[PDB]
Structure formats: structure tokens, C-alpha cells
Structure 1
Amino acid sequence: GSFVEMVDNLRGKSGQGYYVEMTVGSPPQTLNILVDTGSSNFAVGAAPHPFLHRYYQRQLSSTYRDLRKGVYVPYTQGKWEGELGTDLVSIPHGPNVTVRANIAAITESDKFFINGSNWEGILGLAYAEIARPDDSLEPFFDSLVKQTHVPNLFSLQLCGAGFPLNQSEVLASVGGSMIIGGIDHSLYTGSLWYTPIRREWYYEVIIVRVEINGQDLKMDCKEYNYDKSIVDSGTTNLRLPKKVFEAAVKSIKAASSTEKFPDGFWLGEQLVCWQAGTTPWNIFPVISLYLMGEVTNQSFRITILPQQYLRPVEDSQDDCYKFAISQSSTGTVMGAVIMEGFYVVFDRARKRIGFAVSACHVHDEFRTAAVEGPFVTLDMEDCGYNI
């Protein structure tokens, strides 16, 4: 129902990440931790780094336990390396519990920390199957559920401001909510619609249809989930498989063809600027992603606006944006810019993910983001990719 203690416990933005305050060790060491549904390790800065003004100091914690095991985590953009151990962990604006959890003390990294992000570690909220070095390293959420009476569910409301936030504003602003163990009804409007979690590794889902202003992209639905489709708060953009990206960008260009944008804009590399307040939202299409429903042959859709997929960036008094839709070779990624339109319920207990219109989504007087259903959709299991 209502979880006032956890409402408004996030800060940050799509491009630098959304983080929650946590404490580690005895006496407690306060750290800001990025909320990542696209990984499964609780990994924190444990050595000086130019982008960190604080880090976890294992030698100062009386409850620290050394697992005498290293961990090496390469990813696309970079890597993080560290030392495994356990310690007592709490979330000050969370449930009133303290858990004994695994912690990867980061001793080396490349393109991991973000300059000016105000976070010092990440909270891998996905399943043990993708935890590093392997699935025996119990993720934080699994420890939390196992050691307390917290229900096996969390929900995220990521609030994009709709305009740039400077260094001081982003520190003073409310970035959203992470509700641990429940659903807070003040964070959304309309109904919650649930899609099944296909498999418990990433929060994997199945997209069954895509529309650009009601026009069906008309691709074989397997293409939408090649090689997977995931909900990931640790990725900025809506990332699409190569072929889907090329078809979607062609359709988005055609719908907005009253204005021509350079190639670098469509490549998500270059900003586009309009005189203050004149952004022509109306020329850009809405994008609808239909997701497999909980009922056989039934789907629902989530609709996003250009206010979600045009990411506000400071240039001048102009209103500037980056195109926050990009190509992927590792399947669809519903990143923070998509999550900003919705209140997202990671219902681990019922192996499903819920979507509802966010009470904090950015819109205009003419259009709103939407979560609607049901729609008759056949052979949805065929939309899932295999091998």
C-alpha cells in the first residue's frame, strides 16, 4: 500500500545512474549505491579512485569477513576487479533490517565509476545465474529475503527531470523511489500490467509487437528479442538489436520528417538544440512495446513519448537533447530512459514484472505515456529466442 520511509530514496539521472544510500560495516560506513537491475553483484569502491570522495574501508569494519577470493568482471564498456568478502549491510531509507551480505571490494576498474555521479558502488539486483565469479555468490536481494521477513519483491520509480540538472541541483533533487518488499500506490496512475519473467538470470521479458505512432514495425517478433530482452536500470538508453534499431530509426525519421536531423543525432553522438521552450515534441512519434501477458494469447502495451527517448543535456538558454535509442548486438535493453516513463515492479515471488504509468513521467498537455491492455496476440512463446 504505502511505504513512506522508502518513497523518494533515490537520487541521480539516466546518464549517470540512480543511486540509494546504504551503510556497510561496523561502525556503519555510509555509501551511495547505484541501483542496477542488469547485474547481480554488490560491488563497492574499496581503494582511492579519482572519481570517488569516499570508499569502503575493510580495515575499519569489525564485522568484515575476508572470503580470500578475487573477482574479475569484464563487460562491454570496461571492467571492475576486486576482493570478495561479507559484511553487515543496511539501507537507511529502506526496511528496518541489517543483513549479512556478500561485498566485492573494488580494487581496480576501467570505465566503471562515473565522474560527478555521487555513487561509490553498484547494487546488482538481478539473479544468481549472472553473479560473478559464479552463481554460488549469493546476490544482495537473495540474502535480504533469506535473512528477514521482507517479501520477495521490489519496485522502481526512476524520475527523469525532463530538463538538465546541474551539479548542485542533481544533489538536491529527488530522483525517484526504490520500494523494497512492496508496491507504493502513490507512485503510479492507472493499472499495473504484468509480463512474465521468461527466465531468472537478467530480468528477461518477451516483446511481441512494436509500433511507432500506431504503425506496426512489422518484423518477425523473434527479432525484437534477439538474443534476449531485459529491463536494466544500469543502462541509459533503449537499446535495440541491429535490425530492429535500423527499422525503428527509419520509421522514427519518417514520422519526424518535417525536420531534418544530422546523422550524428541518430547515432546518439550529437545533441540537437531548440530555442527555450520550443522543442517540437509533437513531430516525434510515440513508441509502443507490446509485452507478453500473464493470460494465454493476451498482451499489453507500454507507450513512451519523445520526452522519454530524447535525453535532456546542457548545451546557452536552448533546450538540448541526445537521442537515447541505440543499437545493440546483445538484444533489447529497456534502460533508464524507458523506466523513467513507468513504475516498474520486479515481482520475483510471482516471476513477473509489472508496469504502470509513473506519477513522475515527463509529458506535455497533448500526450501521456500509457500502459494499456488487453490485446489478443497469438504464438507469443515463438517470440522468444533460443540457442
Structure 2
Amino acid sequence: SFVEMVDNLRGKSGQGYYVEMTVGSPPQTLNILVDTGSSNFAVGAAPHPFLHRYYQRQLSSTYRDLRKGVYVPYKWEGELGTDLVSIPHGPNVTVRANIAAITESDKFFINGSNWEGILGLAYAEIARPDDSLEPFFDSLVKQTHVPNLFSLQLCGAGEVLASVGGSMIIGGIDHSLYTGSLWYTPIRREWYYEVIIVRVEINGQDLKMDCKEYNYDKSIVDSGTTNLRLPKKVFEAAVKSIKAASSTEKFPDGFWLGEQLVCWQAGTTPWNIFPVISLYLMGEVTNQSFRITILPQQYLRPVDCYKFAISQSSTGTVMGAVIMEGFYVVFDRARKRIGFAVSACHVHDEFRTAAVEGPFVTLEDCGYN
């Protein structure tokens, strides 16, 4: 029953969402980042200044060495093996999964984030060292009767970094988690969770760009990324429009670059001054699309004071947490699609709300690749 998976996610704002997992026998408890933007189950397996716990292979009677290392610059490196893996607040099963035991790493773990490893939920194509190393979710599906699907409701927050909650529903869709209709955009290719954006508007205003720019060189849905990340040309056009809409109030360019924080005090934030942002995603039907509309409450993340959670990308559009936090997101791997619905937990004022709305007719040459 999915009820037992509700609120199975925790995290610190900006530091990602983690689910509790156990590895080995006896079960070693670890907090593990839910990451739809990578494909390795990788866990701290040696002391680290940011690690208070780590996977200890020698303590596990069920550990099996694959005698094969992994070096992953991008860094973390480790030793491959398999072990029994469970998710206490997830499906009631245990799986023998590939585990990359991280023995050394640079700027990989985050200080104070409270997770000790990463659960790469994307596809084998991008797994390290190569695509032969079966990803956790593939193993889970193959070894159990768990349906080939999962969904994420990331809720966010709403002196110490704010705590965020959410739910990872594995093997299905929990209707209590969203309102209205689920709209689906095709997964263009099975590596990252790649999608196509066909239009974007700021406060109703079309950016009027060739839609190839929205997906240059790709667009992906990535829970392991905090920000909405946009290709250069789109970022600039987006910031311009956002600057204009919130003109009545000047902010340092350091804020727009997402380096500096801006502050008011105790519910004086002029949300209404900032525009909503609509991303139109390719629909399941050729020239049919749908939009997800996010509020400033999503793209200004709390740090009184917030940081601009829209930033520039050189590797394509990244729809990260702040985009997902508005919605219930369905990673329908079995049907190669990703659904979006308004989340039961999304943050909104008494004038606007995050929305998922369709259809809108558009007219398929938007992918780059």
C-alpha cells in the first residue's frame, strides 16, 4: 500500500531529497538521495568528513565483490559489488542490486545534507562504468513484481537550512498526492529522463524562440538538481522577462545570477511582483502539448530571504526540484512517458497557483540530439 510510502522523503532545502534505505545483512541504515538524473546506486563506503555513517561491506554477510572498480569524473570512485537492498518505507521487498561503494570522492557529498549515498533512477545507458551495470530500478523491476514506474511528490519547505519533505511512490501512482489531471510528455529517449519542451511563456508572454532552443541539446527531468536550469539563450530571455515583470523593485544582478540572496521580513514578500513561468511539454499526440505553470514561490527558494533558483546551463534544460516541487511527477517507464499533475502539497497564495493544463495545439521538430 502506497500510504506507507507517503512522506518517505526528507532533506534540507537545496541539498536534495533522500529516502531511507538499508544495505547488507544485517541491514545497514543509510539515507540515500533520490536522483532521476543519474543511474548508479552509489554509497559512501569509507569515512568522510561529511559522512557520519557509511556502508561497511565487511559487516555484511551477503556482500559479493564484483572485482571491478569505477572512476567517475564529472568526482567519486569506488568498488563494484552487489548486496541485498531494501527501502523500509517503500515496497516490502528486498533486492540484490549493484552497489558502488564509494571509497574516495571530491565535492560529491554535501556537508549537513544528511544523506550518505545516491540512488540513480535513470537508465542503464548512462550508468558507470558502462551500460552493463544494471541500475537499481531495473534490478528491482526484474527481481520483484513491482510495476515499472515510480512517482515523486517533492514538497519543499513552505537559522538552520529549511527541512523539506516529500514522497517517492515506487511501483505506482498515489491519487491522494495530486489534484486534477495527469498530463504526459513522452520520454524521448531512455538514458536521462529526456523530454521535449515546445513552448515557454513568462506571465502569458511567449518567448517566441525556435523550440529547438528549449531542448538544446536536451531537456531532462532531474530530482538531483535543485534549480530550473535553462540553455544560455533561453536563460537570458527568461531573466529579461522576469526582470521586467518585477521592475517595481530593483535587485542586485548577483541575485539574478543566483549567487546572492534577497530579503524581506515575515510574510512581506511581494510574490505578486514576480511572474509565473509556463513550460509547454510535447504531448503524447504529435501537435498536442500541455503546460506546467510555476509560481515565484517555487523559483525563489528560501535560504525572509530567498535565492533565485533559475540558473544557466550549457548541457540543456534541467527541470530540477523547484520545477518538480509544484507537481506530482510520474516516471512512467513502462510506457516511456512522464506525467505531471498539480501536487497536493504545492505552495501557492490566494491569487495564483501552480497549474498543469492542456491540451494546447502547437505543430515535432523540437528535439535536438
Q: How does 1:196-207 map to 2 (within 5 A)?
A: 196-207=186-197
Equivalent residue number for residue 9 of structure 1: 8
- Cα deviation, residue 174, structure 1: 6.3
Which SS does the other structure have where 1:116 is aligned?
coil
Gaps of 5+ in 1: 163-168, 314-318
Q: Equivalent residue for 1:257?
A: 247
Cα deviation, residue 5, structure 1: 1.2
C-alpha distance in structure 1 between counterparts of 2:309 and 2:286, whole Å: 33
List runs of 5+ in structure 2 lacking aligned partners.
none
Change (3 A) 1:354 1:159: same
Indicate if the aligned counterparts of 1:38 and 1:203 stay in contact, CA closer than 8 A.
Answer: yes
User: CA deviation digits over 1:266-292, x for unaligned, max 9?
Assistant: 000000001221100000000000000
**Alpha-carbon offset, residue 358 of structure 1:** 0.7
1:341 and 1:227, CA in 2 relative to 1: closer, same or farther beyond 3 A?
same
Deviations 1:145-182 (A, max 9, x none): 000000000000011113xxxxxx98996611000000
Instruction: Provide the C-alpha distance between the structure 2 equivalents of 1:101 and 1:321, rounded to a whole number of angstroms.
Output: 39
Secondary structure, counterpart of 2:224 in structure 1:
coil
SS of the residue corresponding to residue 375 of structure 1 reads: strand
Deviation at 1:226, TM superposition (A): 0.2
Q: 1:296, CA displacement in angstroms?
A: 2.2
Aligned partners of 2:46 and 2:103 also within 8 Å: yes
Contact 1:292 1:299 in 2 (8 A): yes
Partner-residue secondary structure (3-state), 2:182: strand
Distance 1:14 1:200 in 2: 29
Deviations 1:193-239 (A, max 9, x none): 00000000000000000000000001110000000000000011000
| CA-to-aligned-CA distance 1:318-340 (integer Å, 9 cap, x gap) | x1000000000000000111110
Q: Deviations over 1:107-132 (max 9, x none)?
A: 01111111111100000000000000
Change (3 A) 1:174 1:263: closer
Runs of 4+ in 1 over 6 A off after TM superposition: 169-172
- In 2: Cα distance, 1:179 partner to 1:171 partner: 25
User: Percent identity of the aligned residues?
Assistant: 100
Instruction: Show the counterpart of 1:165.
Output: none
8 Å Cα contact 1:303/1:371 also seen in 2:
yes
Q: Is the 8 A contact 1:8 1:174 kept in 2?
A: no
Calculate the TM-score normalised by the size of structure 1.
0.94
Aligned counterparts, 1:256-295, within 5 A: 256-295=246-285
Aligned-partner SS, 2:335: coil
Partners in 2 of 1:90 and 1:224 — Cα distance? Answer: 38
Counterpart contact for 1:227–1:330, Cα < 8 Å: yes
The alignment covers a number of residue pairs equal to 369
CA distance in structure 1 between the partners assigned to 2:283 and 2:92 by the alignment:
34
Q: Secondary structure at the match of 2:161?
A: helix
Instruction: Provide the rounded CA distance (Å) in 2 between the counterparts of 1:121 and 1:60.
Output: 17
Do 2:13 and 2:164's aligned partners in 1 also have CA atoms closer than 8 Å? no
Whole-angstrom CA distance in 2 between matches of 1:256 and 1:203: 33
Contact 1:71 1:132 in 2 (8 A): yes
Distance in 2, Cα, partners of 1:270 & 1:300:
33
Q: How does 1:228-247 map to 2 (within 5 A)?
A: 228-247=218-237
Q: C-alpha displacement at 1:13, in angstroms?
A: 3.7
Q: Provide the C-alpha distance between the structure 2 equivalents of 1:13 and 1:280, rounded to a whole number of angstroms.
A: 25
Partners of 1:8 and 1:329 lie apart in 2 by 34
User: Per-residue deviation at 1:31?
Assistant: 0.4
Q: 1:70-98, CA deviations, whole angstroms, 9 ceiling, x for partnerless residues? A: 101111xxx11110000000000011111
Answer yes or no: is the 8 Å Cα contact 1:46–1:106 preserved in 2. Answer: yes
1:71 aligns with 2:79: no
Against the structure 1 CA distance between its residues 161 and 187, is the aligned structure 2 distance closer, same or farther, given a 3 Å change threshold? Answer: same
Deviation at 1:3, TM superposition (A): 1.1
Confirm or deny: 8 A CA contact 1:12 1:170 kept in the other structure: no
Query: SS at the partner of 1:349?
Result: helix
Q: Is the 8 A contact 2:227 2:318 kept in 1?
A: yes
Q: Partners in 1 of 2:349 and 2:367 — Cα distance?
A: 35
The one of 306, 330, 345 equivalent to 1:321 is 306
Mapped to 2, the partners of 1:123 and 1:375 lie a distance apart of 35
Query: What are the Cα deviations for residues 332-372 of structure 1, in whole angstroms up to 9, with x where unaligned?
Result: 00011111001000000000000001111111111000000
| Whole-angstrom distance in 2 between the partners of 1:44 and 1:274 | 39
Cα 1:172–1:297 shift into 2, 3 Å = closer
**Could you say what secondary structure the match of 1:243 adopts?**
helix
Superposition RMSD on alpha carbons, in Å? 1.3
CA, structure 1 residues 192+170, in 2 after alignment: closer, same or farther (shift >3 Å)? farther
User: For the Cα contact (< 8 Å) 1:9–1:174, is it kept in 2?
Assistant: no
Residue pair 2:155, 2:345 contacting (<8 A) in 1 also = yes
Question: 1:48 Cα shift?
Answer: 0.3
CA distance in 2, matches of 1:124, 1:251: 35
